[PDB]
Write a protein that binds this ligand. Sequence first.
Ligand SMILES: CC(=O)SCCNC(=O)CCNC(=O)[C@H](O)C(C)(C)COP(=O)(O)OP(=O)(O)OC[C@H]1O[C@@H](n2cnc3c(N)ncnc32)[C@H](O)[C@@H]1OP(=O)(O)O
Ligand SMILES: CNC(=O)c1csc([C@@H]2C[C@H](NC(=O)[C@@H]3CC(=O)N(C)C(=O)N3)CN2C(=O)c2ccc(-c3nnn[nH]3)cc2)n1
Length: 151
Amino acid sequence: SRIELGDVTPHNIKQLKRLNQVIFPVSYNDKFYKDVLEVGELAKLAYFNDIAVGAVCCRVDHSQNQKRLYIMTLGCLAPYRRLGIGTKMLNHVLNICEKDGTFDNIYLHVQISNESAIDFYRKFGFEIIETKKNYYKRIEPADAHVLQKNL
Ligand SMILES: CC(=O)SCCNC(=O)CCNC(=O)[C@H](O)C(C)(C)COP(=O)(O)OP(=O)(O)OC[C@H]1O[C@@H](n2cnc3c(N)ncnc32)[C@H](O)[C@@H]1OP(=O)(O)O
Ligand SMILES: CNC(=O)c1csc([C@@H]2C[C@H](NC(=O)[C@@H]3CC(=O)N(C)C(=O)N3)CN2C(=O)c2ccc(-c3nnn[nH]3)cc2)n1
């Protein structure tokens, strides 16, 4: 099948909102979707035979005297998993960081129960650097690991 990426645009943001609502256990607010339209290539949809089935949303973060890439959401609808879509999305954002060369690291939060996501990221060089107690407020478990890949 045809598996490729595309932009998040004002015309298709409704599809992104639906994908995130289906995939993730927490809701994202209007501000999140406003911000995704301002990050350029750091937010993308993933398509499988012309239907959007996944997405990645990141932002540049200036914290702890570093320039960091923060991955906020990265996911695929369950029927399309294990087809390389996650890999394509994550390699797209790693390619951007590589071209640039000015990022110190890439990081994200992940619920401690999500073993499969942790192992997926560990394949790309991410490591658990910290565990944030009560990061999530409405889901169980509430703890989040911080995964980081040093660039
Ligand atoms: C910042 C965040 O959003 S953290 C939360 C991440 N997202 C989620 O957990 C949402 C729900 N999960 C998903 O959307 C997906 O399972 C993802 C994003 C974690 C992975 O996406 P996929 O498209 O399924 O991954 P992809 O097919 O590229 O897998 C790459 C490799 O990771 C490994 N892998 C991925 N998922 C699994 C799994 N559940 N079990 C075992 N190995 C796995 C395999 O080694 C795989 O390669 P292989 O199939 O050739 O053996
Ligand atoms: C300047 N930063 C921003 O603009 C910005 C916008 S959203 C964001 C970050 C990204 C972070 N992403 C993850 O946690 C991913 C995806 C996912 O859904 N899960 C489960 C996972 O494992 N990993 C969640 N998020 C929160 O702040 C957040 C969001 C929801 C809740 C909550 N708790 N109870 N209800 N809602 C708690 C924290 N930052």
